[model samples]
Target: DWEIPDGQITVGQRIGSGSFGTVYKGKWHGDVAVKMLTAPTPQQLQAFKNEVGVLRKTRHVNILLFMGYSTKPQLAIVTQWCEGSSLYHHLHASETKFEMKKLIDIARQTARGMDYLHAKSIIHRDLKSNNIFLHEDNTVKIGDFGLATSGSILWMAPEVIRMQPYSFQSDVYAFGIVLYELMTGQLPYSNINNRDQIIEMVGRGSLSPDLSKVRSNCPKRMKRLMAECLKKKRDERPSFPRILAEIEELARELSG
Candidate 1:
């Protein structure tokens, strides 16, 4: 899982780019999204292994499937292409808050994906709006496993923000950030000036504005659910299966 030369990759149109690499929208055998590594440092190589290994073992309705990888001259990873836009785009493009039913449906789908990773002891360190893809039918799909690791801390628990070894509880904390973003169309620490500030706030008991305070349209049950997910104590958060059950129930109620 080390770096490959750029010449090895079959150049395709750019679709997206990030720190690890650039994603190309292309066709190989069938439809695919190709992620090409930018730099192949030794540390990055190990991280690539973690990313590939984790994705290969994961399967859920909401997670993007791993297609394959190339390690010749240039390292390239391919996976199923999501036709629908990312959650980031969806939230910004629309002015109105998503209906409670729609949010619940999405939450249910996302939690299912999280449950799969959690069961295998893999935690997605990043679970922000940008990583969530929403299909045309409004179904959700979680993507971007490059930041994922065997332990949780990145988004799940308070201690994680301080770079503590990860656990499922840390994943739960990050999931709560996603929940908050979905409800508010904003990041959890939007007011923070820098990374240090953000970490300090998270380490303390600070959180984003309560959903109930921002949206009168939200029901008491939904607000409570969000609160549970964003709890300061990692041990206090609901399990993914439990969260799924609550979201599904709420989805049904909202639809009715």
Candidate 2:
């Protein structure tokens, strides 16, 4: 592990903390969220470096922009500050619940971001409701690239989950999980704690039947699209580009 840097960062209060680092609201040239590496092991440090490297090179409106990074005895990665809360918070805060249209809008923006990543051959291994952020203006941004990778695995594909040597298709698989969450307002595997178990279940053709509860509110077309994404066969999933086009059409229709 690297040595901690001396001197205080006059950054804003700590916003969150995770296995890799501590996130603090800070201002360098502008307001930003600074992720200071706090990983206790070398493997964790390598993961942080890889995430910083990937985010530094990838740029998209829907994706979180990497402002800068610092690597010394300790590492710190700075990014744009998103004032809006994560989708996870939003879902739990509302008693009335999100309208189907609003949900679809969020889905569209997320798909746009995923499409952008796919174009660059990047894959977000952890695509979930909590990973997406919704701004006040309804704009969405995909966050948390610490677990992002490149490659395809049959278990996670038609969308990719684990196992490296990743491909853009893995992002598509993760998107399916996200979309499933959006429609049902729940995780794909409700009681499953172990990720490998969930993967095995998904591999064996266990479609998340809970999604059916929200089918009445969600459009059949959109549900079908999500289903295609969740298909067990990797080759059966829609290309990210094609999914984006479909989402654009849906967005236009809903807006009109």
Candidate 3:
């Protein structure tokens, strides 16, 4: 039922590209983003199908809206276009300094989306700023499921880094890192010279960024929440529901 008719899609300018495929701005009744798989093997093809299946089961404002998919000629996943681009680009590439209120709003929306995913027993193994999309209205949408396997090291939880099975708590750890990025506008371990060194430090549980630098700008409650999420013991991390609640409470306080 999720099959998209080929004629309905008209691929346009390329917008993004990754290991799984190249994403292009296209038209499907209106403006849309087309993620066309590039040279996919059987395994990659199956992964694409798996992602589509996951997309089929999900429908939420905080998650990316999957319009449809095409399998003929080539595989393509279609989704609505978001003018604001990825959160990573907004935080890193853009020169504007994001207010604390805006950062909390993005974190709140992302936590809500992750809660929805975890409710379905789905783990978004790769939950980083780059994978989170931003809308023109500042709404946050989670995307990029291709690397959902074997989590990214920089944002990965200690348990996951140690090769343990990942759960919802693991995603919470990544969320903490994302929040850190929002507060500091710097990637975790930004000063590390070698990638292997980062992996080594992370594996040894010694590489979490110092939050003291942003203490003046970030509220103490928000700092505490991030620390709880980045706990070394997976069991210590707060559940998505709790995280969402805390974020909501903080948002209200900030707004007032």
Which candidate gets the maximum TM-score versus the true structure?
Answer: 3
Tens digit per residue, CA lDDT, model 2, 1-256:
2222434344789886665467789866567787877334777678767787678667788888777776654678778887877776676455226787888888888888888887777777666666788766378988773322222222255233324335566567678767776777765555655666556655556644455655466777788888787666667878988998888898788786
Which pairs of residues collide in candidate 3?
none
lDDT for residue 93 in candidate 2, whole number 0-100: 52
TM-score of each: 0.83, 0.80, 0.93
Root-mean-square deviation of candidate 2: 4.9
lDDT tens digits by residue: candidate 3, 1-256: 9899778888889875666577789988899988887466889789888888888888999999998999986898888888876877887788457788888899999999999998988888788988898888489889873522333567887777676467888889999999888888877777777788776787797877787756477888889999999998888999999999999999999887
lDDT of 1 at 136: 66
Which ten-residue region of model 2 has the weakest summed lDDT? 146-155
lDDT tens readout by residue for model 1, 162-194: 565567766676777677767777655555456
- In order, what lDDT does every prediction score? 0.69, 0.69, 0.83
* Cα TM-score of candidate 2: 0.80
* Candidate 2, lDDT over the whole model: 0.69
Selected candidate, larger TM-score, 1 vs 2: 1
TM-score, cand. 3 vs. native = 0.93
Q: Model 3: runs farther than 4 Å from truth?
A: 38-40, 145-152
lDDT of model 2 at residue 222?
80
Pairs that clash in candidate 2: 150-166, 150-167, 151-165, 151-166, 151-167, 156-159, 158-234, 159-173, 160-170
